[PDB]
Amino acid sequence: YNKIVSHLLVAEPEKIYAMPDPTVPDSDIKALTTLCDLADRELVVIIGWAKHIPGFSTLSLADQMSLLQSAWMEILILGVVYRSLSFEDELVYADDYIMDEDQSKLAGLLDLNNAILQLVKKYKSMKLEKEEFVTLKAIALANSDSMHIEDVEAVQKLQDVLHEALQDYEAGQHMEDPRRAGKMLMTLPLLRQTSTKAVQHFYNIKLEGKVPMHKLFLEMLEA
Numbered sequence: 001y002n003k004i005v006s007h008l009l010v011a012e013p014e015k016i017y018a019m020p021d022p023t024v025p026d027s028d029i030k031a032l033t034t035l036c037d038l039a040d041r042e043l044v045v046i047i048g049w050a051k052h053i054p055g056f057s058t059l060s061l062a063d064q065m066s067l068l069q070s071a072w073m074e075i076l077i078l079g080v081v082y083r084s085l086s087f088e089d090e091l092v093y094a095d096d097y098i099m100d101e102d103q104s105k106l107a108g109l110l111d112l113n114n115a116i117l118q119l120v121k122k123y124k125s126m127k128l129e130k131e132e133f134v135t136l137k138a139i140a141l142a143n144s145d146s147m148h149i150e151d152v153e154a155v156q157k158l159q160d161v162l163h164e165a166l167q168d169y170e171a172g173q174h175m176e177d178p179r180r181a182g183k184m185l186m187t188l189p190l191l192r193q194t195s196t197k198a199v200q201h202f203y204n205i206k207l208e209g210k211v212p213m214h215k216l217f218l219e220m221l222e223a
């Protein structure tokens with residue numbers, strides 16, 4: 001099938017561990033510290049991953065950063081969602097960090113995680129495949145809607161190239177539903193929405209200043 005989709009598949013980064021501190025008492029501050037630490041490390045691999053998206057590296061450093069700063073959370077969320085598809089009411093932030101309802105409650109993330117679970121539910125019924133997952137991630141980056149893009153035409157070209165990949169993929173792989181590509185595209189609004197909630201919530205966590213956050217995570221969160 002489509003070359004871009006398969007290129008994205010081989011470019012998929014390895015899983016990373018959350019490694020929550022075994023010596024620290026379980027609390028909302030510990031959970032949040034673990035997640036922001038995990039996100040910070042993921043953001044690093046996400047930046048290296050983006051270089052593999054056709055045309056992305058040709059954009060100016062400025063535009064590349066603009067796209068990443070607008071889409072970073074959507075990309076992080078898609079990952080959690082995909083790793084959770086074969087689970088029930090649980091979010092696999094990492095193999096060693098699976099959050100259920102109670103954990104979400106004590107971490108003060110019940111509403112955010114419930115929203116991510118809404119994403120998981122919809123993708124489950126659509127039987128989201130890994131090929132579609134990786135393409136959606138790339139598309140989410142390209143269709144980020146940054147308010148500071150220098151070369152609008154180039155970004156639209158990137159969006160177009162990736163949209164075509166998904167289209168070509170669905171036309172060849174899912175003959176039974178000539179509208180599957182569109183359905184995949186129609187799941188983006190909920191991703192954008194959930195991402196916005198997460199960024200807002202974690203911004204308030206940054207302000208309350210009771211949770212340490214690393215350089216890269218803070219840079220994205222302060223974009």
Ligand SMILES: Cc1cc(O)ccc1Cl
Pocket residue numbers: 035036038039042076077079080093198
């Ligand atoms: C939403 C999210 C996703 C992820 O993969 C790591 C951390 C956080 Cl806070």
